[PDB]
Amino acid sequence: KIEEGKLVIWINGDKGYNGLAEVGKKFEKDTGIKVTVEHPDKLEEKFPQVAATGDGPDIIFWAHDRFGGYAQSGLLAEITPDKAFQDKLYPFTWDAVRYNGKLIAYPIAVEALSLIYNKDLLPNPPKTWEEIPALDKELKAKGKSALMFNLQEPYFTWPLIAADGGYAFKYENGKYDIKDVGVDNAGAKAGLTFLVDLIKNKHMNADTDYSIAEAAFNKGETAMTINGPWAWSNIDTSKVNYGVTVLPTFKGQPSKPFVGVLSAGINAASPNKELAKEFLENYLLTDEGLEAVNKDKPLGAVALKSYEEELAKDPRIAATMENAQKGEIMPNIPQMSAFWYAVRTAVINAASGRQTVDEALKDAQTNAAASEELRKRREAYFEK
C-alpha cells in the first residue's frame, strides 16, 4: 500500500481518525503529500504480520505496550527528535516509548480507564465494587441496570483483577522478570471470581462488547460504564448527564487500570521516514494538530506540555489522571502480547462458563511465559 510519494497511517477505530485525517489534509495542502488514514481491524496483530513481507503503513498508532515487540523484531525505525523537541513533551511519556535505551515511537497522549456514570440515574456513584450488585437489583425497579462495559477485551476487566494483587510481570530493580507472572495468585482469582459471579447472577452478560455497552450507556439504559477518554465524544452527543470518576475499590483497594501511552511508530520498511517525522513533529504534535484529533475523539492527557496545560482544567481529565496514578504504566516488553492473549482467553473462558476461574487463570499463568514460542518467529524471511 505504501509508496515513495505518500503517507499511509494506521490508527484504531475508536480514536479520532477523522481529526487525524484533517491534519493529513493540512499536510497535503502544504507539501503535496497525500495522507491516507486507515483503521484496520485488529491492526496491532496485523502490523507484525504484513511488515515482514515489506508491507504495512508508514506510521502505526497504538498504545506503547505493543511497541517493544515490534522493536524487538526490527519492525520500527529509530526516531530522532532533537533536544528542543523532547523538551516539549513530558519526560515520563518518553520513558514509555523507550526500549533498550532507544526511542522507538512518538508519544501522543496518556490513556486510563475511568468510571463513567449517569448523574440523573445515579447522583452519587458507588465507591465500591461490592455494592454494585445491590445497586443493580435496586435499579431494576426503574427498568435499568447498574453497569455495562466491554467484557471481550481484558483491558477493561484488568483493573478489577489487579485490585487485590493481580500483576503482569514482576518488576524488580529496573527489569521485568518474564518468568514471574501474577495472574495465578489469590488476589487475581478473587477479582475474576467477583466478575464471573456478576455474570452468573445476570447482573452482567458475558456477550457484552464495546458497542453494546456504549449503546446502553448512551441511551440511558445502564447507570454506569467503564471506558477511556475516546468514549466521551459519543456520550456528549447522547445528552446523557454524565460524570467521570474514580473506579470502584475492591476489597478496600483501588482498581488498578493498565495505563497506556498512545504512540506513533515509523515502519522500518517505510520509504517515507523523513516525511513521517515531519508530519508527526511539526503537524500532529502541535497545539493545532492535537486539537483537531482531540475535538474528534478526546485523547486524554496529551504528551505535549503546552496543550496539556490548556486541557488539564477539564474535570474528566483530572479523573483520568487520578485513575492513572492508582494504576500501573504498561510494560512494553515483547512478552506483553503473550500476556494479553493469555488473560484474554482466561476472561472469556471463565465468563462463558467453559472453564472455572481457578483453571482459567492457571492456564493463563503458563501461556504468558510458554506461548512465547508462537510469537518468537525470528523473521520468516531474513535472519536476526
Ligand X SMILES: OC[C@H]1O[C@H](O[C@H]2[C@H](O)[C@@H](O)[C@@H](O)O[C@@H]2CO)[C@H](O)[C@@H](O)[C@@H]1O
Q: Which spans of this chain sit near Zn ion (rule: CB under 5 A)? A: 133, 137, 164, 251
Is the C-alpha dihedral spanning 108, 114, 120, 124 positive or negative? negative
| Cα–Cα dist 120/161, whole Å | 29
Considering only 16-24, 61-69, 239-247, 320-328, which stretch makes contact with ligand X by CB under 6 A?
Answer: 61-69
Strands 34-38 and 167-172: unpaired
Query: Least distance (Å) from ligand X to the CB of residue 275?
Result: 25
**In angstroms, what is the C-alpha Rg of the chain?**
21
Select the residue interacting with ligand X from 28, 95, 130, 153 (CB under 6 A). 153
Strands 114-118 and 222-227: antiparallel
Number of residues that bind ligand X (CB under 6 A): 12
Select the residue interacting with ligand X from 67, 155, 232, 250 (CB under 6 A). 155
Q: How many CB atoms lie within 10 A of CB 209?
A: 13
| Cα–Cα dist 51/68, whole Å | 15
Contact present, 351 and 196 (Cβ < 8 Å):
yes
Binding positions for ligand X, 242-281, rule CB under 6 A = 260
- Per DSSP, helices labelled H in 17-144 are 17-31, 43-53, 67-72, 83-86, 91-96, 132-140
| Cα–Cα dist 125/146, whole Å | 10
- Per DSSP, helices labelled H in the chain are 17-31, 43-53, 67-72, 83-86, 91-96, 132-140, 154-163, 186-200, 210-218, 232-238, 273-279, 287-296, 305-311, 315-326, 336-352, 357-370, 372-375
| Cα–Cα dist 323/44, whole Å | 25
Query: Least distance (Å) from Zn ion to the CB of residue 282?
Result: 6
Q: Which is nearer to ligand X, 111 or 214 (CB)?
A: 111
Which partner, Zn ion, ligand X, none, binds residue 260 by CB below 5 to 8 Å per kind? ligand X
Would you count residue 108 as binding ligand X (CB under 6 A)?
Answer: no
Select the residue interacting with ligand X from 65, 164, 296, 308 (CB under 6 A). 65
Q: Report residue 171 as a C-alpha cell.
A: 518488576
Considering only 22-30, 135-143, 149-157, 233-241, which stretch makes contact with ligand X by CB under 6 A?
Answer: 149-157
Q: Which is nearer to ligand X, 14 or 28 (CB)?
A: 14
Select the residue interacting with ligand X from 16, 58, 66, 281 (CB under 6 A). 66
Which partner, Zn ion, ligand X, none, binds residue 65 by CB below 5 to 8 Å per kind? ligand X
Considering only 20-28, 62-70, 174-182, 237-245, which stretch makes contact with ligand X by CB under 6 A?
Answer: 62-70
Contact present, 194 and 132 (Cβ < 8 Å):
no
Contact present, 107 and 302 (Cβ < 8 Å):
no
Would you count residue 214 as binding ligand X (CB under 6 A)?
Answer: no
Query: Least distance (Å) from ligand X to the CB of residue 153?
Result: 3
x-marked contacts with ligand X along 330-349 as a string, rule CB under 6 A: ----------x---------
| Cα–Cα dist 151/243, whole Å | 22
Query: Least distance (Å) from ligand X to the CB of residue 228?
Result: 6
Query: Least distance (Å) from ligand X to the CB of residue 91?
Result: 21
Is the C-alpha dihedral spanning 271, 63, 374, 174 positive or negative? positive
Would you count residue 324 as binding ligand X (CB under 6 A)?
Answer: no
Query: Least distance (Å) from Zn ion to the CB of residue 151?
Result: 19
Query: Least distance (Å) from Zn ion to the CB of residue 223?
Result: 15
Considering only 128-136, 148-156, 240-248, 363-371, which stretch makes contact with ligand X by CB under 6 A?
Answer: 148-156
Which partner, Zn ion, ligand X, none, binds residue 137 by CB below 5 to 8 Å per kind? Zn ion
Using CB under 6 A, list all residues that contact ligand X: 12, 14, 44, 63, 65-66, 111, 153-155, 260, 340
